[PDB]
Design a protein around this ligand. Structure first.
Ligand code: 34U
Length: 265
């Protein structure tokens, strides 16, 4: 352990896109928090993107998004600390797994994910790393979205993006072109939500390959296939298929997802 003002840092509870997350005991109020720890020296090798993330996080207040509580940043020290609310049960699942969620459990969590993403997009944030391991289950059984390390703020109705970040298996095909292109940010989050929902019920990603180039090729050019087990409802298959439409112009949007019959039953 190690003391940091009123906090006692304990075991590591996650990695993430940048830095690590540690359990932290707060002596003043007698409870635990989650603390993201960053090295400025390590960031400088791999400043203002961190303060961009902090400005994003300070804007967000929703029950399905993890709350930033405070930031501890001494210009003397190499480490920067971001204190978040702790969400007890941690990630909803690891992928791959042989114990996927039931349809009913998946629907419950997906409903939380819709509300969270809808909120983020309203606040003009693209998350860019939606996946099961970034969705934390609270004491009340609801999910909270975490890890804004590669998230983008935009102006107007959508982000116009040209860079590829996040977790390879969750990247939309339009973001994997060989030549520089521009693509819509909201549709990227929808694609990642579709990969996430597939993972919820099958316990594995729809496109997988150990070789990065082949994974990209599959995401771009392999038709979606459902595994043999478990069997799932027709309406869930339809929803997943529409979220993993390779054409971002025809891909289902969040207002349409909210009205899908799998979501509303
Ligand atoms: C069995 O799990 C025990 C609890 O685990 C966690 C793990 C992370 C937690 C958390 C609880 N309560 C809040 N967070 C936060 C709070 C802020 C974060 C900022 C950036 C990245 C995070 N994660 C999310 C989980 C992922 N698997 C690793 C990186 C963050 N996670």
């Amino acid at each position: 352990s190690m003391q940091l003002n009123q906090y006692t840092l304990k075991d590591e509870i996650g990695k993430g896109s940048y830095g690590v997350v540690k359990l932290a005991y707060n002596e003043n109020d007698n409870t635990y928090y989650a603390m993201k720890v960053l090295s400025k020296k390590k960031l400088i090798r791999q400043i203002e993107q961190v303060y961009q993330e902090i400005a994003i996080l300070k804007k967000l207040d929703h029950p399905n998004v993890v709350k930033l509580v405070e930031v501890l940043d001494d210009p003397n020290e190499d480490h920067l600390y971001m204190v978040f609310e702790l969400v007890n049960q941690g990630p909803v699942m690891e992928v791959p797994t042989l114990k996927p969620l039931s349809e009913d459990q998946a629907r419950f969590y997906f409903q939380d994910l819709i509300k969270g993403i809808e909120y983020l997009h309203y606040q003009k944030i693209i998350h860019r790393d939606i996946k099961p391991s970034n969705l934390l289950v609270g004491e009340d059984g609801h999910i909270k979205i975490a890890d804004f390390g590669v998230s983008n703020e935009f102006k107007g109705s959508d982000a116009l993006l040209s860079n590829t970040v996040g977790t390879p298996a969750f990247m939309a095909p339009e973001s994997l072109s060989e030549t520089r292109k521009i693509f819509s940010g909201k549709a990227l989050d929808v694609w990642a939500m579709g990969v996430t929902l597939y993972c919820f019920v099958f316990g594995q990603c729809p496109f997988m390959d150990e070789r990065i180039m082949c994974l990209h090729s599959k995401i771009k050019s392999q038709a979606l296939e459902f595994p043999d087990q478990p069997d799932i409802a027709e309406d869930l298959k339809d929803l997943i298929t529409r979220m993993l439409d390779k054409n971002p112009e025809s891909r289902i949007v969040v207002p349409e997802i909210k009205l899908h019959p799998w979501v509303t039953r």
